[PDB]
């Protein structure tokens, strides 16, 4: 029994690594659905700007297929799709929209999916029709960040354009010079928003996901090596050092095979990785263990997504403002220097709106940081401190 | 399994046996921080020492099992306090090892406790000796201290007395170390080595090992005399810090140009030296008193102190 | 957005900089000195991106992207003959006229008014090779003439032709007060454009370059040409993230976006531990505290009374994230900043090049920092406090060829007036931003 | 813990030959520079790094730097240890000073060439990380050698502030012609006086006597003198080369010996059991400690009269008993006397026998050696010094070896000599004042 078990488990691990590309689909899932290798997502958004914002339904799916085509083409991940050996991987990608309403909620429901097949569909836990769709929850939760990034970049560029444009006025009415100061100061305001976003994002992608993925690959990988140290040692989070296994004799001649993983361990470890991601204090929604903090009484993800939506409205209004500056330049540069400037009235109105939203933002953020300091947990405490 | 070399590997970590090499390296690297950290170590923030040890351990031989399981740990209650858990802030650090698979039936946990305590004491002494040695190196090398015709009062009262008391302290410290290591430690390792010859009963081996360790612990030089040594260490620590300061302090005492300045500084320096010296005389006399009040350390430690 | 970069090489020193730079770059990706693949095709998988900088043909030769500038074909040809491949010979450019430094800025300016009429077209043809282009670059030393003139004309010519396109600059500042009869002229002229054309600028101080080089080089003290390779080492750490893609900052735009607030403040002081060249066993903790060290800078002229506005940090190597958390704690506890800020310093953890001649690293890292701090104008004060004393006297006021700008001495004198006003307004704004009420222009309205 | 050794002059390099010979066969190397152990995989029980540099192919390069003027004598050693010594470490002059010259021309040559000598020592320094100090091995009588030693001694001391220096010095037996060298000798002291941190002195009368006692059939045994010298140096560094509990750096050794740096001249003694008929007279540690106090064991022939001791530091190597050593101090504190203004300072440094020389182990065999600080050290000065108090005024043959940094400008020459002798007088009166109980 011992011999057969050893032999069969060994051959199974070997065939998984060598024929169906295990450990290439895992890294592929991290580099596609869990938001890593961001350049792919950047290129996707860039090539699908016209459609993610389409205010319509019954959308042409063919264009999205072309989109995934040229997306995997543009990113570094073309190095996969180019190679015959692992070309199979790229085939599994697909994109979806769920229509619960008319108004371009596709951007609010755009979903990237990866369909598996036997044998791998049995070993890896993915968007099973009767699962929890954890990948989908994570992917939406991070797609929010990505929407923020895209809009902020575009409009930052248009801003710097317009400030550079008005710089050539100083032989004219200094009221236009006022614009400069206001816009410049206004610009700082926008940055105070945007940077905050990135901060949280980094934490998410570098203290929640990545650490877990590194642990999963470490455990799944330890079986691969040969003894670089003859002590099968474990290093802990508390400095504990423990040697498991038997202290074997040193090849002693008194008188005259290592532990790899079967199928259940594979499915077990992948599920552990996923659930330990979603049991973190920055994702949990609906248990008894949704401990709320002082000064707010709300779930952390709920308040955070409120912050992010507020960020979205800020981007919209700043877009309007920069637009306003653009047509002001348009009417100024031409003949009508007796230009009606109720546009300036709109300018002041929108500044008032912006400053209102910004004061509300700082207030909510102060509530947020105080909430995390109330939490007392070391990593959340340090996140709170870093935000200052 | 080669029990002999594993015991020797343990000892070289926990008794210093033939490893003073290692202790010198460790102290010379980390003394600049270990000197000052032990005032407010409640908020640990000791990332640097842990990280540095982690790095240095990677360099060592992998064919030594024991060095691999070496961990740096801290705690709060001090050395005499942790001995108060045995029979009812200077260097409150710690080394421990979780002995491997249940072949460790040879090596208990109580033995590891006592080994920990012993290493703690050794590091205390070695730290103080390293300070004194750096001080000696400073007193005879920095040109600031060389005599180039200054004032007979300053030599009579500042530099010569400083040297005299420094040498006194160093002689005492080295004498303490000499007694301890020579007439305390070699007994146990020698018995343990001799019981490796003609081995007949495992239980006798275990009993002898623990007996040697306990016989190390029973010495009142760790239990009853220890507050004397800690007050000693306070005095010597403060004096050595003062001298390290003097290295740059002396710069403004000579041809600011004696300009109604540093005259009270000279007087205060004289008094500081005098008071520290007198304190140390009293403390050595009381150490004499307890030595005489009630182990070849007798007529071994007392030779360098008994005043002429 | 996020794609290909085109770099520009201004002058002879800059062209040396670029030669060393591309040495280091092609070393990182294991690229053959002649431009053919230095890797056996046994592996077909590749896990980094060279599309932003290079182009490829049916014969798997890497065509670089760059432009090499002067009127003297000596340095260009030296670089070319250094690598018998590794460059396209059709992307260089040389003029045919008189040669001089200094106020030949003006003639150099005229070079463009004579020659850019086709030069950018070269650029244009090249830019038509790709689809997604996100920005240019420039390497320069402010002090020299030909480079300064061509760089300023190029910046002006590009700022109005390719909108929504980023232009970064790399500029080094001299330490000698000798040529100040003409030197502090060109410098000031150059600033006039770096205030209206650059989208972000990094500043270097040759005095600190040589000081650090002598401090760290285990060979005795030698020339600056062997110190040049300490420039590219910084430009490796930038664009590291877009060469070995990872979680964040896979674009250049986002990089200065986390560096640069409102466009008036675009001067950046680099720094890092030059733990390499072309050891030191430091952990992450040591690196991220050594970057605080006042001895560690590439513009080391400031008094320890500074004010940071923005900080970027990076690390190359495998790192424990906990050390980053602790180090952010420590650094925030030790640095100063205006009270209108809510963000902080940022950290990106990069990927060490994997084709490198590697031994086991054992958590030994290579740090780096850019800082937008208040003290950059300090490196200016020497040239701030020199040219005007000569302007009262006008030494070398005639070294301008007429062109179509040097017809009236008043023309030149007005140029200098405008320039000094520009730089003075710059320093005014940097000082004003330090006070906690900078936002009053919009937060005290009725 | 790296140590850099400087050897100079004919005597210095003869010393180096024998010294590195004993050290090497103490560390299982042989004349080639490879391991003599049958298994390279097994770990070792010492650290040879403090004296030897290591490469990939397991060749050990002694970090020894040798100086000369006539390369013949320094050439013999590599013609005995092939491929052992690095030849770039030697330095050879051409047409320099006269045979047996006064130190002056050697000092001139040293001032001329110290630039490249300093570059050499710097490049050997760069080879390592943990540098502890230098060592200097030479005689004072030799002209070019002592001039070079003085010049480089100044160069090291002023360039290098944080590094210890230890020098070993050789003095001729009281004889006839050294009335020039002894003459010359005085100025040499000037440097060691101010620049040396610790130093131990050697005379040839007691060396010849030891030879007359140990080895049979003596004809000329200067080689035996070098034997004893190397014996002493290796014994001193034993406790550093084979680690033990306490002393693992050189500074820690001397720090017990030297009060204020006006008293740093040390006098050795050693057990009759040698290190090159040896089987006798090694009876016991009790015996070793006792017979250490025999004046006949001194490495400088002095007189015995109620000697006054400053610092006693002895080391016993081998398998020892606690009881013997205990009783030994028990009566030596009573017998040994020291000035009443300080306290007793007796230190023992039990060490290790080297487990790579196939020794002949007995159960209680030991050897021992001792360093001390004396008043009688000044006795070695007077023997030479008294001489030039009688002759220097005449100067007929004295000036002729042209003893000065300038030639024939004898005014500055007498200036140097007078300042030197008065500095020596300061030393002597200083040791007397430490003697004369005046601070009591
Ligand atoms: N860092 C560095 N700077 C240099 C070097 N050589 C020259 N420079 C600087 O470059 C400036 C000269 O620029 P130059 O090459 O004459 O400009 P060009 O005439 O337009 O090519 C001087 O101010 C120098 O300080 C070098 O090797 N390294
Ligand atoms: N150390 C040592 N010195 C010796 C020995 N035999 C003789 N000497 C002295 O060592 C000195 C070496 O002088 P040195 O300058 O090296 O000889 P030179 O090069 O010919 O001038 C001579 O004055 C000898 O008197 C010996 O065995 N050991």
The closest of B244, B278, B246 to B168, measured between CA atoms, is B278
Write out the residues of chain C at the interface with chain B, using a CB-CB cutoff of 8 A.
281, 283-286, 323, 326, 362-363
Distance of alpha carbon D232 from alpha carbon D166, whole angstroms: 14
Torsion angle of C-alpha atoms A145, A148, A154, A157, degrees rounded to 10: -100
Alpha-carbon torsion (A10, A12, A15, A17), positive or negative: negative
User: What is the C-alpha to C-alpha distance for residues D429 and C137, in angstroms, rounded to an integer?
Assistant: 78
Count the residues in chain A: 388
Q: Ligand 1, closest atom to CA C146? A: 20
Q: Give CA–CA dist A154/D24, Å, rounded.
A: 75
Helices (H) and strands (E) in chain A, counts: 16, 4
Find the helix packing angle between C183-194 and C145-158, rounded to 10°. 20
Q: Which segments within chain B are labelled E, that is strand? A: 71-74, 93-96
> Which residues does C408 contact at the CB level (< 8 Å), separation at least 6?
none
Q: For residue D177, give how far its alpha carbon lies from the nearest alpha carbon of chain B (Å).
A: 37
Contact residues on chain B for A245, CB-CB shorter than 8 A: 101
CA D169–ligand 2 middle distance (angstroms): 11
Q: State whether the beta carbon of D62 lies less than 6 angstroms from ligand 2.
A: no
Q: Nearest CA to D405 among D168, D196, D193, D106?
A: D106
Picking from C196, C137, C202, the residue whose alpha carbon sits closest to that of residue C168 is: C137
Å from D415 to nearest chain B CA? 20
What single DSSP character describes residue C37? B
Report the Cα–Cα distance between both ends of chain D, in Å, rounded: 41
**What is the biggest distance separating any 2 CA atoms in chain B, rounded to whole angstroms?**
82
C257 alpha-carbon distance from chain centroid: 16
Q: Which residues are bridge partners to A96 per DSSP? A: A111
Against chain D, the chains showing at least 3 CB pairs within 8 Å are: B
Distance, CA of A352 to CA of A350 (rounded, Å): 5
Length of chain D: 440
If one residue of D110, D143, D170 were mutated to test the ligand 2 pocket, choosing by the most ligand atoms within 8 A of its CB, it would be: D170
Of the candidates C44, C50, C73, C48, the residue with the CA atom closest to the CA atom of residue C62: C50
With a CB cutoff of 8 Å and minimum separation 6, the contacts of B57 are B67, B68, B70
User: Rounded to an integer, what distance in angstroms lies between the CA atom of residue B120 and that of residue B72?
Assistant: 12
Taking the CA atoms of residue D271, residue D275, residue D278 and residue D282 in that order, the dihedral angle to the nearest 10 degrees is 30
Distance CA(C104)–CA(C189), nearest Å, equals 12
Smallest Cα–Cα separation from A184: which of C252, C166, C425, C336?
C425
Tally of helices (H runs) and strands (E runs) in chain B: 13, 2
DSSP states of D232-274 as a string?
A: HHHHHHHHHHS--SS--SHHHHHTTT-SSTT--EEEEEE-SS-
Q: By the CB < 8 Å criterion, does B182 face chain D?
A: yes
Among A18, A28, A24, A27, smallest CA distance to A93 is for A28
Using only the alpha carbons of chain C, give its radius of gyration.
22
Answer for the pair D423, D325: CB distance below 8 angstroms, yes or no. no
Cβ-contact D203, D173 below 8 angstroms: yes
Q: Which of C94, C140, C144 to mutate to test the pocket of ligand 1 (most atoms within 8 A of CB)?
A: C144
For β-strands C139-141 and C166-173, DSSP reports them as parallel
Q: What distance in Å separates the CA atoms of residue C235 and residue C249, rounded to the nearest whole number?
A: 15
Q: Where are the alpha helices (DSSP H) in A75-169?
A: 78-82, 88-91, 106-109, 120-123, 134-166
Report the distance separating Cα B32 and Cα D210, nearest Å: 48
B18 within 8 A of D243, measured Cβ to Cβ: yes
CB contact, 8 Å: A240 with chain B? yes
Phi first, then psi: give them for residue A346, nearest 5 degrees: -65, -35
Q: Give which of C201, C205, C192 is closest to C167, Cα–Cα.
A: C201
Q: Which member of D260, D261, D343 has the closest CB to residue B171?
A: D343
d(CA C185, CA C183): 5
Burial class for A118, CB neighbours closer than 10 Å (0-12, 13-18, 19+): exposed
**Contact state of C441 with A181 under an 8 Å Cβ cutoff:** yes
Q: In angstroms, rounded to a whole number, what is the distance separating the alpha carbons of residues C94 and C334?
A: 51
Q: By the 8 A CB rule, do B217 and B114 touch?
A: yes
Helix axes B110-139, B226-249, angle to 10 degrees: 30
Residue C50 dihedral angles phi and psi, to the nearest 5°: -110, 5
Interface test with C, best of A157, A194, A208 (most C CBs within 10 A): A157
Which method resolved this structure? cryo-EM
Q: Do residue C285 and residue B55 have CB atoms under 8 angstroms apart?
A: no
| Residues pairing with C56 in the sheet | C62
How many CA within 13 A on the CB side of residue A203?
A: 20
Residue D60 to residue D35: CA distance in whole angstroms: 9
Beta-carbon contacts of residue A111 (< 8 Å; ≥ 6 apart)? A95, A96, A97, A98, A136, A139, A140
Q: How far apart are the first and last CA of chain C?
A: 40
Distance of CA C148 to the CA centre of its chain: 14
B300: distance to nearest CA of chain D, Å? 7
Element (H, E) at D150: helix D143-159
d(CA D405, CA D386): 25
Task: State whether the beta carbon of C101 lies less than 6 angstroms from ligand 1.
Answer: yes
Cis peptide upstream of residue A249 (ω within 30 degrees of 0):
no
Quick count: other Cβ atoms within 10 Å of Cβ B149? 6
Quick one: D340 exposed, middle or buried, by C-beta within 10 A (0-12, 13-18, 19+)? exposed
Do D186 and D416 contact (CB within 8 A), yes or no? no
Kindly list the structural domains of chain B, giving each domain's residue range(s) and its CATH number in brackets, ordered by start. 4-294 (1.20.120.1900)
Can you tell me whether residue C184 is helix, strand or coil?
helix
- Show the 3-state SS of chain A: CHHHHHHHHHHHHHHHHHCCCCCCHHHHHHHHCCCCCHHHHHHHHHHCHHHHCCCCCCCCHHHHHHHHHHHHHHCCCHHHHHCCCCCHHHHCEEEECCCCCCCCCHHHHCEEEECCCCCHHHHCCCCCCCCCCHHHHHHHHHHHHHHHHHHHHHHHHHHHHHHHHHCCCCCCCHHHHHHHHHHHHHHHHHHHHHHHHHHHHHHHHHHHHHHHHHHHHHHHHCCCCCCCCCCCEEECCCCCEEECCCCCCCCCCCCCCCCCCCHHHHHHHHHHHHHHHHCCCCCCCCCCCCCCCCCCCCCHHHHHHHHHHHHHHHHHHHHHHHHHHHHHHHHHHCCCCCCCCHHHHHHHHHHHHHHHHHHHHHHHHHHHHHHHHHHCCHHHHHHHHHCC
Which residue of chain D is at minimal alpha-carbon distance from B134?
Answer: D251
Is the CB of residue C376 less than 8 Å from the CB of residue C269?
yes
Question: Are A231 and B65 within 8 A, CB to CB?
Answer: yes
Set of chain A residues whose Cβ sits within 8 Å of the Cβ of C360: none
Distances (CA, A) of B191 to A10, B109, B196, B289: 50, 21, 9, 33
- E-state strands within B126-198: none
Smallest CA-to-CA distance from D328 within A32, C359, C190, B182 is with B182
Using a 10 angstrom Cβ sphere, with 0-12 exposed, 13-18 middle and 19 or more buried, the burial of residue D394 is: exposed
**DSSP annotation string for C123-152:** HHHHHTT-S-EEEE--EEETT-HHHHHHHH
Helix axis angle, D222-241 to D9-26, nearest 10°: 50
Backbone phi and psi for residue C373, each to the nearest 5 degrees, phi listed first: -120, 170
- Closest-approach residue (CA) in chain B for A234: B69
- D207 CA: nearest ligand 2 atom: 27
Given a contact cutoff of 8 angstroms between Cβ atoms, the answer to whether B178 and D347 are in contact is yes
b/e per residue D138-173 (b: at least 16 CB within 10 A): bbbbbbbbbbbbbbbbbbbbeebeebbbbbbbbbbe
Say if the Cβ atoms of D256 and B307 lie within 8 Å. no
Helical pair C12-28 and C145-158, crossing angle rounded to 10 deg: 70
What phi, psi does D283 have (nearest 5°)? -55, -55
Tell whether B296 lies on the interface with D, counting CB pairs under 8 A: yes
Interface of B with D in 219-278 (CB under 8 A): none
Q: How far apart are CA C306 and CA C327, in angstroms?
A: 20
| Resolution of this deposited model, Å | 3.7
Q: Residue D309's beta-bridge partner residues? A: D374
Q: Do B55 and C326 touch (CB under 8 A)?
A: no
Q: Is there a contact between C339 and C352 (Cβ–Cβ < 8 Å)?
A: no
Beta carbons of C438 and C338 less than 8 angstroms apart: yes
Q: Which chain C residue is nearest to residue B57, measuring alpha carbons?
A: C362
In a mutational test of the C interface, the residue from B55, B56, B60, B62 whose CB has the highest number of chain C CBs within 10 Å is: B55
Please tell me the distance between residue C383's alpha carbon and the centre of ligand 1 in angstroms: 16
CB contact under 8 A, B51 and C323: yes
Distance CA D318, CA D369 (A): 12
Chain A residues touching B63 at Cβ < 8 A: 230
Cα–Cα distance, A23 to A213 (Å, whole number): 12
Q: Which atom of ligand 1 is the closest one to the Cα of C223?
A: 27
Q: What is the SS3 assignment for B91-140?
A: CCEEEECCCCCCCHHHCCCHHHHHHHHHHHHHHHHHHHHHHHHHHHHHHC
CA-derived radius of gyration, chain A: 27
Name which residue sits closest to atom 25 of ligand 2, judged by CA. D172
Cα D293 vs. chain centroid, distance in angstroms? 21
Q: Do residues C273 and C287 touch, judged by C-beta distance below 8 A?
A: yes
Spacing, Cα D73 to ligand 2 middle (Å) = 11
Distance C186 CA to ligand 1 centre (A): 13
Instruction: Give Cα D264 to chain centroid, integer Å.
Output: 13
C321 Cα to the center of ligand 2, angstroms: 65
The rounded radius of gyration (Å) of the Cα atoms in chain D is: 22
**In a 3-state reduction of DSSP, which class is residue B210?**
helix
- CA neighbor of D321 nearest in space, from B180, B187, B209: B187
Q: Which atom of ligand 2 is nearest to the CA of D144?
A: 15
- Consecutive H or E run containing C370: strand C366-373
Closest among D366, D375, D25, D369 to D229, alpha carbons compared: D369
Collapsing DSSP to helix, strand or coil, D419 comes out as helix
On the CB side of C91, how many CA atoms lie within 13 Å of its CA?
A: 19
Yes or no: say if C28 and C53 are a contact pair by the CB < 8 Å rule: no
Torsion of CA B76, B80, B82, B84, to 10 degrees: -130
Between the alpha carbon of residue C193 and those of residues A172, C14, C105, C116, the distances in Å are: 22, 18, 13, 17
Pairwise CA distance, residues A180 & A168, whole Å = 11
Q: What is d(CA A176, CA A323) in angstroms, rounded to the nearest whole number? A: 16
Please choose, from the candidates C254, C197, C239, C253, the residue with its C-alpha nearest in 3D space to the C-alpha of residue C54.
C239
Q: Could you tell me whether strands C8-9 and C67-69 are parallel, antiparallel, or unpaired per DSSP bridges?
A: parallel
CB of D184 within 6 A of ligand 2: the answer is no
């Amino acid at each position: 029994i011992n011999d057969q078990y050893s032999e069969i488990v060994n051959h199974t691990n070997q065939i998984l690594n060598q024929k169906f590309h295990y450990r290439d689909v895992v890294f592929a899932l991290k580099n596609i659905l869990l938001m890593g290798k961001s350049d792919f997502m950047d290129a996707l958004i860039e090539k699908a700007n016209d459609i993610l914002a389409t205010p319509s339904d019954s959308l042409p799916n063919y264009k999205l297929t072309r989109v995934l085509q040229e997306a995997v083409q543009l990113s570094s991940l073309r190095h996969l799709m180019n190679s015959p050996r692992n070309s199979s991987v790229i085939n599994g990608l697909d994109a979806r929209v769920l229509d619960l309403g008319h108004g371009s909620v596709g951007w609010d429901v755009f979903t990237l999916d990866y369909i598996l097949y036997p044998p791998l569909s049995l070993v890896l836990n993915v968007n099973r029709p009767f699962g929890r769709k954890e990948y989908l929850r994570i992917f939406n939760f991070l797609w929010r960040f990505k929407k923020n990034n895209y809009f902020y970049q575009k409009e930052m560029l248009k801003s710097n354009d317009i400030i550079r444009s008005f710089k050539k006025i100083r032989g004219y009415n200094p009221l236009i010079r006022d614009i400069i100061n206001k816009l410049s100061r206004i610009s700082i305001l926008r940055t105070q928003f945007q940077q905050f976003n990135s901060k949280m994002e980094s934490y998410y992608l570098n203290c929640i996901i990545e650490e877990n993925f590194k642990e999963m690959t470490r455990k799944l990988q330890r079986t691969e090596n040969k003894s670089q140290n003859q002590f099968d040692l474990i290093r802990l989070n508390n400095g504990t050092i423990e040697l498991n296994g038997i202290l074997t004799p040193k090849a002693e001649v008194l008188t005259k095979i290592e532990k790899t993983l079967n199928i259940d361990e594979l499915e077990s470890v992948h599920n552990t990785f996923l659930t330990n991601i979603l049991s973190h204090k920055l994702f949990a929604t609906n248990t008894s263990e949704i401990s709320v903090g002082d000064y707010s009484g709300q779930p952390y993800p709920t308040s955070l997504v409120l912050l992010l939506n507020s960020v979205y409205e800020f981007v919209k209004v700043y877009c309007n403002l920069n637009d306003i500056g653009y047509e002001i330049f348009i009417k100024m540069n031409l003949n009508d220097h007796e230009a009606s400037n109720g546009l300036l009235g709109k300018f002041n109105t929108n500044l008032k709106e912006i400053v209102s939203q910004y004061k509300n933002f700082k207030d909510r953020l102060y509530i947020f940081r105080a909430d995390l300091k109330n939490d007392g947990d070391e990593e959340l405490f340090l996140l709170s401190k870093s935000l200052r | 399994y080669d029990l002999i070399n594993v015991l020797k590997h343990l000892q070289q970590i926990f008794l210093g046996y033939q490893s003073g090499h290692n202790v010198l390296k460790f102290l010379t690297k980390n003394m600049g921080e270990l000197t000052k950290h032990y005032r407010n170590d409640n908020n640990a923030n000791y990332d640097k020492l842990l990280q540095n040890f982690e790095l240095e351990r990677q360099s060592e031989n992998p064919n030594n099992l024991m060095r691999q399981l070496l961990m740096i740990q801290f705690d709060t209650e001090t050395l005499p306090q942790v001995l108060s858990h045995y029979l009812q802030a200077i260097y409150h650090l710690k080394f421990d090892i979780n002995i491997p698979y249940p072949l460790n039936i040879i090596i208990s946990r109580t033995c590891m406790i006592k080994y920990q305590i012993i290493l703690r004491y050794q590091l205390v002494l070695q730290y103080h000796s390293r300070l004194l040695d750096e001080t000696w190196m400073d007193l005879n090398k920095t040109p600031s201290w060389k005599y180039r015709g200054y004032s007979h009062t300053v030599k009579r009262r500042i530099v010569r007395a400083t040297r005299v008391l420094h040498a006194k302290m160093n002689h005492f410290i080295k004498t303490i170390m000499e007694y301890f290591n020579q007439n305390v430690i070699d007994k146990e390792v020698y018995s343990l080595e001799k019981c490796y010859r003609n081995p007949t009963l495992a239980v006798a081996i275990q009993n002898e090992l623990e007996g040697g360790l306990t016989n190390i612990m029973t010495n009142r030089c760790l239990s009853d005399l220890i507050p004397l040594q800690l007050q000693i260490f306070d005095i010597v620590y403060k004096f050595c810090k003062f001298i390290k300061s003097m290295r740059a302090k002396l710069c403004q005492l000579d041809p600011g140009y004696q300009e109604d300045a540093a005259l009270e500084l000279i007087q205060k320096l004289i008094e500081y030296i005098s008071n520290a010296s007198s304190i140390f005389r009293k403390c050595l006399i009381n150490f004499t008193q307890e030595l005489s009040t009630e182990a070849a350390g007798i007529e071994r430690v007392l030779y360098s102190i008994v005043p002429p | 957005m996020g794609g290909e970069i085109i770099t520009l090489q201004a002058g002879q020193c800059g062209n040396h900089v670029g030669k060393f730079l591309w040495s280091q770059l092609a070393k990182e990706h294991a690229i053959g000195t002649d431009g053919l693949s230095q890797l056996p095709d046994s592996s077909t998988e590749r896990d980094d991106d060279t599309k932003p900088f290079f182009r490829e043909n049916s014969r798997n030769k890497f065509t670089p992207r760059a432009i090499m500038m002067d009127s003297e074909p000596s340095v260009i040809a030296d670089v070319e003959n250094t690598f018998r491949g590794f460059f396209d010979p059709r992307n260089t450019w040389v003029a045919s006229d008189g040669a001089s430094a200094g106020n030949s800025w003006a003639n150099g300016y005229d070079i463009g008014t004579r020659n850019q009429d086709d030069i950018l077209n070269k650029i244009d043809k090249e830019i038509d090779s790709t689809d997604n282009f996100e920005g240019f670059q420039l390497l320069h030393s402010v002090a020299g003439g030909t480079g300064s003139g061509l760089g300023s004309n190029l910046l002006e010519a590009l700022c109005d032709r390719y909108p929504k396109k980023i232009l970064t600059t790399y500029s080094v500042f001299p330490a000698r007060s000798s040529e100040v009869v003409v030197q502090s002229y060109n410098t000031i002229l150059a600033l006039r454009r770096l205030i209206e054309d650059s989208d972000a600028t990094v500043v270097f101080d040759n005095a600190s370059l040589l000081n650090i080089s002598g401090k760290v080089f285990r060979n005795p003290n030698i020339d600056l040409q062997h110190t040049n390779q300490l420039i590219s080492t910084i430009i490796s750490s930038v664009t590291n993230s877009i060469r070995f893609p990872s979680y964040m900052y896979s674009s250049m735009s986002s990089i200065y976006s986390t560096l640069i607030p409102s466009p008036e403040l675009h001067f950046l002081s680099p720094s890092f531990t030059p733990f390499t060249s072309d050891h030191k066993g430091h952990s992450s903790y040591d690196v991220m505290l050594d970057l605080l060290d006042p001895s560690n800078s590439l513009v080391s002229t400031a008094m320890n009374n500074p004010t940071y506005f923005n900080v970027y940090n990076t690390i190359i190597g495998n790192v424990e994230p906990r050390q980053i958390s602790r180090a952010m704690t420590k650094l925030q506890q030790r640095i100063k900043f205006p009270s209108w800020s809510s963000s902080a310093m940022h950290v990106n953890i990069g990927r060490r090049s994997p084709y490198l001649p590697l031994q086991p690293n054992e958590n030994e890292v290579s740090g780096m920092m850019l800082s937008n701090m208040s003290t950059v104008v300090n490196v200016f004060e020497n040239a701030c406090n020199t040219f005007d004393k000569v302007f009262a006297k006008g030494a070398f006021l005639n070294n301008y060829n007429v062109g179509d700008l040097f017809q009236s001495m008043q023309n030149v004198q007005d140029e200098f007036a405008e320039s000094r006003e520009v730089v003075q307004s710059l320093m005014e704004d940097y000082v004003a931003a330090e006070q906690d009420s900078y936002l009053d222009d919009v937060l005290v309205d009725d």
